[PDB]
Design a protein around this motif. Sequence first.
Motif, PDB file in Angstrom:
ATOM      1  N   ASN A 197      -4.135   8.753  -2.068  1.00  0.00           N
ATOM      2  CA  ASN A 197      -5.577   8.603  -2.119  1.00  0.00           C
ATOM      3  C   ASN A 197      -6.231   9.967  -2.075  1.00  0.00           C
ATOM      4  O   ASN A 197      -7.248  10.221  -2.716  1.00  0.00           O
ATOM      5  CB  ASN A 197      -6.049   7.753  -0.950  1.00  0.00           C
ATOM      6  N   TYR A 198      -5.599  10.861  -1.336  1.00  0.00           N
ATOM      7  CA  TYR A 198      -6.214  12.109  -0.980  1.00  0.00           C
ATOM      8  C   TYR A 198      -6.087  13.041  -2.162  1.00  0.00           C
ATOM      9  O   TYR A 198      -7.045  13.698  -2.548  1.00  0.00           O
ATOM     10  CB  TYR A 198      -5.531  12.674   0.250  1.00  0.00           C
ATOM     11  N   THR A 247      -8.351  11.822  -4.883  1.00  0.00           N
ATOM     12  CA  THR A 247      -9.733  12.174  -4.630  1.00  0.00           C
ATOM     13  C   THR A 247      -9.950  13.631  -4.949  1.00  0.00           C
ATOM     14  O   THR A 247     -10.972  14.011  -5.520  1.00  0.00           O
ATOM     15  CB  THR A 247     -10.117  11.906  -3.187  1.00  0.00           C
ATOM     16  N   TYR A 304       0.797  -1.208   0.000  1.00  0.00           N
ATOM     17  CA  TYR A 304       0.000   0.000   0.000  1.00  0.00           C
ATOM     18  C   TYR A 304       0.832   1.261   0.000  1.00  0.00           C
ATOM     19  O   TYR A 304       1.923   1.307  -0.561  1.00  0.00           O
ATOM     20  CB  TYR A 304      -0.933  -0.001   1.199  1.00  0.00           C
ATOM     21  N   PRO A 341      -2.025   7.695   2.882  1.00  0.00           N
ATOM     22  CA  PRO A 341      -3.308   8.228   2.442  1.00  0.00           C
ATOM     23  C   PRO A 341      -3.102   9.258   1.358  1.00  0.00           C
ATOM     24  O   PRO A 341      -3.971   9.443   0.522  1.00  0.00           O
ATOM     25  CB  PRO A 341      -3.871   8.871   3.704  1.00  0.00           C
TER      26      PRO A 341
END
Lengths: 457, 594, 54, 34, 59, 131
Positions: free
Chosen positions: C15-16, C19, C9, C12
């Motif tokens: 991902n952030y 997004t 992984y 975040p």
Amino acid sequence: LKIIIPTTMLLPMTWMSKHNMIWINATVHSLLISLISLSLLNQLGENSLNFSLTFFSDSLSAPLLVLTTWLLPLMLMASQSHLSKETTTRKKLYITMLILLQLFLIMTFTATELILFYILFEATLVPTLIIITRWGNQTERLNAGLYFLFYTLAGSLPLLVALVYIQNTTGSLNFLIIHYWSHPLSNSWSNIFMWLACIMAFMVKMPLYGLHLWLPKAHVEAPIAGSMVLAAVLLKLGGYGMMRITTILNPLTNYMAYPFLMLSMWGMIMTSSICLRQTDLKSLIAYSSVSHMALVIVAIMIQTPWSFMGATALMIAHGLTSSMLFCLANTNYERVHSRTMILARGLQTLLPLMATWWLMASLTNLALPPSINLIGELFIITASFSWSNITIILMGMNMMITALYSLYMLITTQRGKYTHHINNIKASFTRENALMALHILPLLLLTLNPKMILGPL
Amino acid sequence: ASLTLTTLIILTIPIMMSNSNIYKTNLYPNYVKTTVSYAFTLSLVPLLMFMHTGQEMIISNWHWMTLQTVELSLSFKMDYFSVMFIPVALFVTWSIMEFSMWYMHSDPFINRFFKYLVLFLITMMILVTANNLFQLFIGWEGVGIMSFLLIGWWHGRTDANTAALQAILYNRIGDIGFVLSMAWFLTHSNAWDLQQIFMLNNECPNMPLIGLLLAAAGKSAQFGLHPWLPSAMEGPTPVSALLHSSTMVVAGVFLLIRFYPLMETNKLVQTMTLCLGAITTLFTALCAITQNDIKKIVAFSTSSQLGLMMVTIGINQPHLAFLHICMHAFFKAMLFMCSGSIIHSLNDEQDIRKMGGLYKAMPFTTTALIIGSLALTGMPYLTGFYSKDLIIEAVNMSYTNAWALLMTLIATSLTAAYSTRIIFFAFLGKPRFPPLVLINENNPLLINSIKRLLIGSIFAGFIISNNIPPMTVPNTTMPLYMKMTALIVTIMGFMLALELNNTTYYLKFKYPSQTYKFSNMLGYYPSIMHRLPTYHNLSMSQKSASSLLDLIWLETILPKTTSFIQMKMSIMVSNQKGLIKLYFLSFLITIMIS
Amino acid sequence: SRWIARTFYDGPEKNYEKTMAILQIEAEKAELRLKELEVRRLMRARGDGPWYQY
Amino acid sequence: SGFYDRRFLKLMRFYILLTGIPVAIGITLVNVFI
Amino acid sequence: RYYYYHREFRRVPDITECEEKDILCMFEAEMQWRRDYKVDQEIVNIIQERLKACQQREG
Amino acid sequence: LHKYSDIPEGTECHRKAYASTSIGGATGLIVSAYSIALKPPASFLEGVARTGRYTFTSAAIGAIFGLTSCISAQVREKPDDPLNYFIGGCAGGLTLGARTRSYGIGAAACAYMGLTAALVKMGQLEGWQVF
């Protein structure tokens, strides 16, 4: 997009596979891709996970996705002795239906646009139709095909038009922004028809008590590989979508929930009651399935966070347990072709380990602690009870009858005398035990770590 | 701390060994009896550390699932109750182990049987120990299903199966109430933990207590729910001895015991608890007066004891209510095991009326059954006394409804009654069992078993009544007949029952009165509450639900409708013909309209 | 857990940011669609626009 | 015949443990050291 | 003894002041609000645990 | 239809009922027209018998619908909600049920004609565009 490509890639592999080896190919790689699917599960504690512009992976979807990837090998293990005398090209054609199907599922769970989600939501309909109609036994299957079909479409089509409407009355149809840009719709009369338009399809695909008639008559007919999907998954996906679209609606849901809460709260006790007196097992299981889905649907409509937690858990648990009961019944149906439950009689006497699986499976059907089935159910009873203190008196009756018929299917098709002349039974294949062990083990490990299955809320 | 958790966890291991080849061996079970033996040996220690210094403990080693606000976690509270109770269960169950090795010694699958034994007991431990309410629910329900697996052991005969299903059914009916309460504490107190709930509920809870009461009625076989317990005797004897005597059914009131202070918050709870526990003592005891099975009689007895201790809770004296159980187990296990000796001895003939008069044929069993019957009777310094007398006396001196107290009196009479019935027919008469006599008391392990339970059966009342801290605070004043009443009612029992029984011995055929037919038809209750509602439902579930409601209307209303309307329309539009003048003229008028 | 957090992984952050970019893009399309419907209703209403005139 | 069942258990136990040992031991070694 | 240490997130301006249509303000502030919510839940968890502690601790 | 549209509300039930009677009569003549067109009656007197049938039936349905609707409006005096037509809708089927002398067709006609009318009123309230 990484998990989804290989799922496509098995198809060339299937077609190019050596004629008597295909089962091994599809099995092995489907297992592998399951394990790859499992890495998705991580999610995040805050923001919904994201990917491409066109996919995302909410915690609500991930356990479902893992499940859906997980089922393919199982259906293969069940199928691969059910059929044998079929020609190679036809068999090779056959598994393609299954895998094509799950491909549509992996796509339709991660969504993201609700129009994409819809078109796949309805695209699932074809392969399952083909499977029910060509490989089901006995005549009625033909008729069954139709019931399975129009009840979906008659529900889905208005939903479709409704979707288009919204992306015109607002900006984008995309899920994230609509989760954020969401604004209340309220009373009038146009808005009410909007409400039913955005609910009825989802409430058809997971059967509702007034509308469930197609479902038993699907399960009576479909070859088991069709049964496992038609039960364990499609219902649950209808639930997934209905949990999705509830981002809009409100406050109107407060006003429109009541009729469906009556059809559900009453239909659960009712269908369970019908469940208490079936002629033949394969239907008994199906009505048990509706009898549990009613709980999901009220759990969604009372819209309390506990209720969605319980919604998720119960969706998955009922998935596995129902599929398990189906394969576990097909075994008898193959050993004796009876179908009718009365002929099986003293099956325990003649073989033991299957009785053990009957025990575990039924045992978690009634849901006793700490099965994820149970814990899934208790929450929604909690939130329901918050919603109305009376409601418990209904839920309790369910927990009565679901005991009875469940134990009933056990004690009637097992404990008791063997039928004398039925010499047909032949002492349990390895694949059988392997298969149901494959259903039930994950189901039990899974209790250790609920916190990864409860979902977004 | 390490101690109690060890006195639980080691029990788990043999089940684990169940997949190991030793399980397939004949050799397995004695490892189990030894296992429970070590378990007991270990089990004494916490009780003693509990003794002189009196400390108590809760541990919750691992949170299982952290929700918002609520975070349920397994938690083994080890209070007075949970510490005191364990050695008892280990003790009697160990004796049941040793008994069962002989009772079943012929039987195939016996190893599986023991596996189910340990598997049951461990769930019982789950119930007695658990703090967190949910864990109490897993112990609850799991004990229920073990009851199902054992009742159906002789799965061949249908009656076993109906008995099993019956038991699960009434338990479930109790479980509804259990869930109602279990939700309500969460919605209100926001808890599922005895700390939380005891803390936040100084206010009166008008309703959860009654549903929880119904749950307590579940396992405990109150009057509304009694019959499954008599029918549960149908499973093989060591099973019924195992838990229908004690280890299972007492838990149903044990639950209610655990939540005393909340009961104390209400008046109506103590009220209704008493209101019903009394009448179940009476109504059961009456049927107990006149049966013919050994085991049915002993069953009605055990339920009657349960009603008695139930008013003991309802009289607002929880401590003694718990105290009665610990005595009760020894008595009942004694009765069922000696009875098992009789039954196995004779090639299994439960019916007393052709049970022999074998006072000398099995003298040791005789002795055993005698001390047992005297213990249950409540003899003045024997073990049953230290419960029963303190109980009924406390009921006397308490403010309460009196009619129920009256019921306690007739009940405690009838205790002596049936207890003399079984003695009389079992031993005294000139024997009348069919000729040949395979009788053989001998087989040392059985002897040792009954021995140990006798030992407890005589010393435990005194020892335990002495060692426990005086939570009771004694009532010892007015009047003198107060204490006498417990004895005189018994004496009336023996005199009436025995003179009556001797009067049965004097020829003169008579035909039954209505009261006989009543009390010997178990109160008619099963034969009406089973042949009736089940009929209306199973009929209703076909006369209506399966049929017209959902196979014939619910399908008529929208498949068959549209499917018909298209028949009409389709034959109407496609009218087969095709003559030109027809539709062509139709083009005309459609233009005129257009 | 550390080693998994390394090999597989990510923080975040990716991902952030992803997004973020997503919400920006899709929002822009949304507003453009609505504006387009305005432009169209007007342009057909008047004919003043280049692309509805007959 | 009880052969087929016991065979099944032999197999299943053999595999779950086959992979079972390396994993458990790996977890323990990770516990004691790092 | 290679080892971890705590992570922390910087403050951001809240939704109340971002305008009616910015998604990014609504989003940043949304994540902040959400973190704050989960935190607050954890605090209530703590105070309940201390409650249980006091309850059992009394004789 | 524009004539029928100016109810107003439900005042003067006769004035309205006459108009509904008119509409029902119109539709009856149309249905009779195509029926005669596509089902050659043979012997023309039978044809006028047919058209008399349909015309009178539809006219009746319109009459009874109209007046029950307005009466309900002038009695409940709610008077604007859609249910106000629905009774008449339900009533209309029964009228149709009477001429057909069948409980079945009358029963179905009650429900569906009722729902249709209710949707119509709801539509007047909401300006639904149909075309």
